Amino acid sequence: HKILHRLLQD
Amino acid sequence: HKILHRLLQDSS
Amino acid sequence: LALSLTADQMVSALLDAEPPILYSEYDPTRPFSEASMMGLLTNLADRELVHMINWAKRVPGFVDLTLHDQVHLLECAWLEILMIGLVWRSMEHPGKLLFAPNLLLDRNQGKCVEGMVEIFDMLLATSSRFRMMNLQGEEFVCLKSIILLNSGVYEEKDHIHRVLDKITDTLIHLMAKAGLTLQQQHQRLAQLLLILSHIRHMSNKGMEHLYSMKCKNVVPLSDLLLEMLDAHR
Amino acid sequence: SLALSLTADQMVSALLDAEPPILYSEYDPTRPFSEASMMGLLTNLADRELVHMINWAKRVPGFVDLTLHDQVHLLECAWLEILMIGLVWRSMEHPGKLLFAPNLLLDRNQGKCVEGMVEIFDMLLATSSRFRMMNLQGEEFVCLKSIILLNSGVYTFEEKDHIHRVLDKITDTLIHLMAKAGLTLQQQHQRLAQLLLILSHIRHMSNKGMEHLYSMKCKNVVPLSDLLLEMLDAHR
Ligand SMILES: CC(=C(c1ccc(O)cc1)c1ccc(O)cc1)c1cccc(Nc2ccc(F)cc2)c1
Ligand SMILES: CC(=C(c1ccc(O)cc1)c1ccc(O)cc1)c1cccc(Nc2ccc(F)cc2)c1
């Protein structure tokens, strides 16, 4: 959860 | 007019 | 492995990871207003955020950090980095802020948004400051990487400080090449890092206004900007 | 200006000598503090420290050579940062504690006595410990504090070129201190950079502190001195 969190994974 | 003005001018 | 890179490599890696200069959705026919200008700056920023996040992954060391730390650093410095970028772009446009190639703004255009004037002036002052210092592209990327790693650092995370020291070594190396004396090398280093103090100032003042806006007149913020924003409130 | 002629040693001795006195808080063991009394103690101490800060400022080499207005601008912009780096510096030998005064030593708790104070405490505490692990020296502290005074408001102004000239001098003084302590050329600039980066966070702590002091002014209560209100309005 958390967009910033998600984007940092891709 | 500012208190700061007085303190700067009367600085010791 | 970020601690085994030579100064030249650091520069190359950072210069390589440089995000593109995005374009505004500025429609020159559309008459300006409060909502539109902040909508313009907000949308541009929202798209830049996506490039910044991916630029962060390419900053030496950033990936070595835990994922929770990465989030913290970015939530802390995202506006600072947006600002130093804006300032670096506007460098050769005195009295003007180059938000985008198609969105070039001067002081008086800020007045269209209340309280925008002070922010524009600090930004303009920073760029002119960059201009009289003749800030170099190689130096800029180092500063921006420093902002990313430093702004949110305050168990034992001396790694981030290890990388920070590396970048400091990189900055000195750059100045030694430019033919500066040792004394000049340390003076310019000081001058550069002290500017970050004022960039921090602009960021906090910026955040401040962004809060107000949100819970007030609704200049709709992107869902990403909203999450980043709450990280300061 | 006579500030540029000074040597590293001369710059140092002049700064140590300008150091403000350590002030005491309104003693009264009546524990624990409420919120009105806590903010009252801090406000009064800060208000008294300010008077001395101005005396200290005038003794910082190069500050006297500034126009009255320039001097006012700088102080108005950096007054809380200056108070904070002082607080932080006093708290160094008291891990997990803020030494507002010799008779006012607040730990992590007690920051709760005021809503939104615990967050400020922890940044302050974090800065203090950072200083401690770096083994910050007094001669370096005075250099840092003077830098904040001259730098914080310089980008919101011949007179500016002057300030930057002095700032360079203080940098020369810093590197000199590090050279004397036996640091390698590389350790010198790494430390220099380290110390200056901390100034960015002291600026941060100040900005947060400012906006709180407003809400506390706008919401009235906790009577602020006219001097404070005047320093405050310069940030609103
Ligand atoms: C320059 C800028 C932004 C920016 C920075 C760099 C960049 O490349 C693009 C934009 C910015 C503007 C809006 C936003 O939602 C996020 C950032 C920005 C950021 C915060 C505040 C302000 N001024 C303001 C905002 C609201 C208000 F009510 C009064 C004043 C301006
Ligand atoms: C530590 C400090 C002060 C200080 C620093 C150094 C020093 O030597 C003495 C005091 C300070 C506190 C009150 C004041 O009026 C001025 C400064 C200070 C300054 C601003 C804000 C805060 N925290 C706060 C304030 C109001 C609120 F509602 C919630 C949190 C703290």
Numbering used by the authors:
A (entry chain D): 687 to 696
B (entry chain C): 687 to 698
C (entry chain B): 306 to 459, 470 to 548
D (entry chain A): 305 to 461, 470 to 548
According to the publication:
The indirect modulator scaffolds in cluster 1 did not show cell‐specific signaling, but shared common structural perturbations that we designed to modulate h12 dynamics. Based on our original OBHS structure, the OBHS, OBHS‐N, and triaryl‐ethylene compounds were modified with h11‐directed pendant groups (Zheng et al, 2012; Zhu et al, 2012; Liao et al, 2014). For the triaryl‐ethylene analogs, the displacement of h11 was in a perpendicular direction, away from Ile424 in h8 and toward h12. Ile424–His524 distance measured in the crystal structures correlates with the proliferative effect of triaryl‐ethylene analogs in MCF‐7 cells. Indirect modulators in cluster 1 avoid this by perturbing the h11–h12 interface, and modulating the dynamics of h12 without changing the shape of AF‐2 when stabilized. We have identified atomic vectors for the OBHS‐N and triaryl‐ethylene classes that predict ligand response. These ligands in cluster 1 drive consistent, canonical signaling across cell types, which is desirable for generating full antagonists.
ERα contains structurally conserved globular domains of the nuclear receptor superfamily, including a DNA‐binding domain (DBD) that is connected by a flexible hinge region to the ligand‐binding domain (LBD), as well as unstructured AB and F domains at its amino and carboxyl termini, respectively. The LBD contains a ligand‐dependent coactivator‐binding site called activation function‐2 (AF‐2). AF‐2 binds the signature LxxLL motif peptides of coactivators such as NCOA1/2/3 (also known as SRC‐1/2/3). In the canonical model of the ERα signaling pathway, E2‐bound ERα forms a homodimer that binds DNA at estrogen‐response elements (EREs), recruits NCOA1/2/3 (Metivier et al, 2003; Johnson & O'Malley, 2012), and activates the GREB1 gene, which is required for proliferation of ERα‐positive breast cancer cells (Ghosh et al, 2000; Rae et al, 2005; Deschenes et al, 2007; Liu et al, 2012; Srinivasan et al, 2013).
